[PDB]
């Protein structure tokens, strides 16, 4: 009975965001997404170290799905037989039966088809959630996204004014809870079941041995840095599914940023640092003003240069000297100075 | 010299709350109310855990006090003299001497009385706070709760609009830190004083054994689970004495969120997740529109799932099927379907 | 070729805040200041346990640095040739060349002078951030502080209404990561380099051992406890460069709290307690009502009462006994009373 046209999404790999438009002067329509869930080993550090991963679509996190507000998302999730365990799906965006968990419970070799309208604007977190103790050990080995619900007139400042990205990035933040032997050498197993109750004793803790962005420690830095131009605004969507993190641009700022991430509330201005509670999306807008390279971290400095918590950008354009410059280069402390006389010695 | 009416209000057990106003037309009272101290042995988890916890009434949390702005709110603290420690309380709601615990320091076999002036609207933590490291100690023993300062023309959405609830429950949060023996094992004593130095061990570390609505794990799910109906607007309030929560309506959202907890400011819109910080209540309201099961989380999933913080809503009602539908139930991947040929593969 | 007035600043050590214009008709000017690097060891509790310190002008947190928005702030930063490591500066309210840290890293024996543009008004950390494994260490080792950048107008309460604060504190909240040997006592070292293997071990785990303010447990209590009187605005700035904090201030509140610290957002207001999002600063204000102690603190009250995280305000004046009164002090519970017929018994 649901008479709208259908359009079929393909996704991509994060950090990358399937094409959408921003502002659309077209009605609602049912957005047709696949998610299959994929189980298998990843590499998740610098020194190689693997894990016994829960994924949607082969990444962690899951691919963002962007839609506008009043479309209906219609997701077909697959759960293959060469899987082990069950799989189910819970949107934050959508409304009613766990978020679709209680619908869509799927074996291996099994799929279904849940139907969920995008009535709430913002990024959401959406995430497996079988039931009981499965729910954070799914999560937390990986299975993990988030939606975009947009406003069908695009972003707004809050105060009426429209805003436009001209680059959009996902960056999915998890947390891994590894086994460690009596050495501290990190432990590995062949299957995820096998890896559960070590990992469960793990996570009991709450502390992580590994934070990371787009599934590794290193994953969005080197090669596959995240590239802008001077003058570009850029989107940057945050995600945490289980624990609290803290972003921030260094050298930057967020120019707008809605931290509890949901567009019905204006953002706030030039941040250096937000907060995105475990269990949501927020997202921050930037226009950039200098090149460079720029980190992007978790502030908690300990988790982002000692537990994989650092992505990097590189931004081409012309540096400007009035924002900042380097007035004197270092140089050996002048003789006469008389250091010795302040206050604090 | 004070001439107002006194009115005395009895309490009730959490989840629930006294009956009271929102909008009221009555000018300001004094408004009375009495907290009995109870140090007792508590069953705290499903396995049958007990603890050495110390109680306002008899119930973590304490029970949720109710007045309005302008009222004048007179406690009588009682500390029997079955008791073995001095207690006192300390409300976030009011102005001076370290929030009434400089006033209300009482032995064992001792009562003090207390009249703060309510001038700040919102939901506030009591506790206690004997002084040094009994503070922490008390507080995560069990003796917090949370008063709430009503506006007198009720709730409103911030830009003008009258917001009513048709059910309110308080939820409080109690982290807990129960030493363990050499094999894992959970310890038990005979006394809060037996208990304090290998609890204050676990507490030095910050990570609790669990974390707990209503006292105990599982204590509001099951035959107790919260009620409500299809259309209502529930007002769920949220403290934490010692530790921040990330509140999350699994199936829901929290259409206004207070989550700093306090009526002078608007309410954010439309949140996935919200955030309490530690030493704070905030509010969320929402209105069901779907029935069946819900849970209600602090959405690190370790801690709902496997610390013990869950409660459920059972929400009676008629589905509906334009939020969402399952369009197929889980079936076999179709032989034909061709999903080795996806990006991810 | 920039052409504007010099003005040199003479920093002074937190909690104290050196002398400034809250609003001015100045125009832009280069504000000039000086940071020299001091590693050291310094004590950092009751105990007298000692650590390897790093920091900025011989404090922790460094100096608060006070200019207007579109000043230019132009920094030296000192290396002393006493020092063994290489040193540098990322201003959070600066644009480009991470903060500033890529255009200032100097060895022992060598200085830079940094001039970046106030184009951000709010509070902002700075720290040091020299590279990879090295940026938490220096952080957590002390080599943090802020800077406040005002609008012209001074502060104001997002509703057009000017606030003008009659005191200013600065509260630099630092967590510490101290070794302990086999027996549980804190481990001394001679030098920053000797403790770097067991400290980051420490780190690796995320619980600090100690949560100080102003650089030390018992800092700000005591003969230190920060004055106060009756009828004051006193303006709070509270960082924390590396982990999250929850500020309350027991027997008040935040009259006015920015609690993402950047006054182009409206404060909330009548806040109990607020959150410091680890890389970052915040502040609050508050008109003292009541005269006596209070304690500022974190409230995870575990890191306030057994961590070191605790301030005192004396605050002079005369009690309003219509705010709050003692109506009856600590007397034997009445023989009469019927305290056992309670529901809750
Ligand atoms: O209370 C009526 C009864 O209907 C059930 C049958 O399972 O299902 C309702 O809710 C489902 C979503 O949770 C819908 O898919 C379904 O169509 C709707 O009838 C039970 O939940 C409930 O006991
Ligand atoms: O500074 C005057 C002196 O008065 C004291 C006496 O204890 O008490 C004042 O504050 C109390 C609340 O903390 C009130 O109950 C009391 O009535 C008021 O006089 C001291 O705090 C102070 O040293
Ligand atoms: O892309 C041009 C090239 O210029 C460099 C030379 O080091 O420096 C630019 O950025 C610096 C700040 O990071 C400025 O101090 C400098 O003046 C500006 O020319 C490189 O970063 C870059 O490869
Ligand atoms: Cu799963
Ligand atoms: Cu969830
Ligand atoms: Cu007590
Ligand atoms: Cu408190
Ligand atoms: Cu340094
Ligand atoms: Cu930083």
Redesign the interface.
């Known amino acids: 009975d ?1 008479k709208l046209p259908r359009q079929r999404v ?4 994060p950090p990358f965001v399937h094409v959408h438009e921003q502002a659309t002067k077209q009605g609602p329509k049912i957005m047709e997404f ?1 998610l ?1 869930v ?1 189980e298998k080993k990843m590499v998740i550090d610098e020194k190689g170290t693997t894990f016994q991963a829960m994924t949607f ?3 962690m996190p899951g691919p963002l799905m962007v839609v506008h507000e009043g479309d209906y998302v ?1 997701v077909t999730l ?1 759960n ?2 060469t899987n082990t365990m069950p799989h189910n799906i ?1 949107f ?16 291996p ?9 995008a ?4 990024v ?2 959406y995430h497996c ?1 079988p039931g ?2 499965m ?2 050990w799914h ?2 080995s990986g299975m993990n996204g988030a939606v975009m619900v947009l406003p069908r007139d695009g972003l707004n400042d809050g105060h009426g004014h429209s805003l436009r990205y001209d680059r959009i990035y996902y960056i999915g933040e998890q947390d891994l809870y590894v086994p460690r032997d009596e050495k501290g050498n990190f432990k590995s197993y062949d299957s995820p079941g096998e890896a559960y109750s070590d990992t ?1 004793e793990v ?5 992580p041995t590994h934070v990371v962005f787009n599934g590794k420690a290193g994953a969005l830095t080197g090669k596959n840095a995240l590239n802008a131009n001077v003058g570009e605004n850029v989107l940057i969507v945050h995600s945490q ?4 993190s ?1 972003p ?1 641009l ?4 967020g120019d707008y940023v809605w ?4 567009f ?2 204006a953002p ?8 995105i ?5 927020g997202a921050a807008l930037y226009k950039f ?2 090149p ?4 992007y971290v978790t ?9 994989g918590a650092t992505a990097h950008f590189k931004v081409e354009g012309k ?2 000297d ?13 003789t006469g ?1 008389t ?1 010795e006389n ?4």
């Not at 934050?92 to 074996?107: D, E, R």
């Not at 706030?268 to 907060?275: M, N, Q």
């Open positions: 649901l393909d996704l991509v790999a696949k299959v994929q679509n082969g990444s219609e697959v293959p037989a819970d934050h965006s959508a409304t009613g039966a766990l978020g679709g968990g209680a619908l869509t419970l799927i074996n070799g099994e799929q279904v088809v849940l139907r969920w309208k009535t709430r604007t913002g959401f977190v959630a009981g103790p729910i954070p999560v937390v469960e996570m009991r803790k709450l502390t599914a289980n624990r609290d803290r921030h260094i050298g930057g700022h931290e509890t991430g949901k019905s509330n706030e201005t030039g941040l250096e640092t937000w907060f509670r475990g269990g949501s999306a003003l200098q460079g390279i720029y980190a502030h908690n400095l300990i988790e982002a240069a000692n537990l540096w400007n009035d924002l900042m410059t380097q007035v004197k280069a270092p140089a050996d402390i002048p100075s250091n302040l206050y604090f010695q």
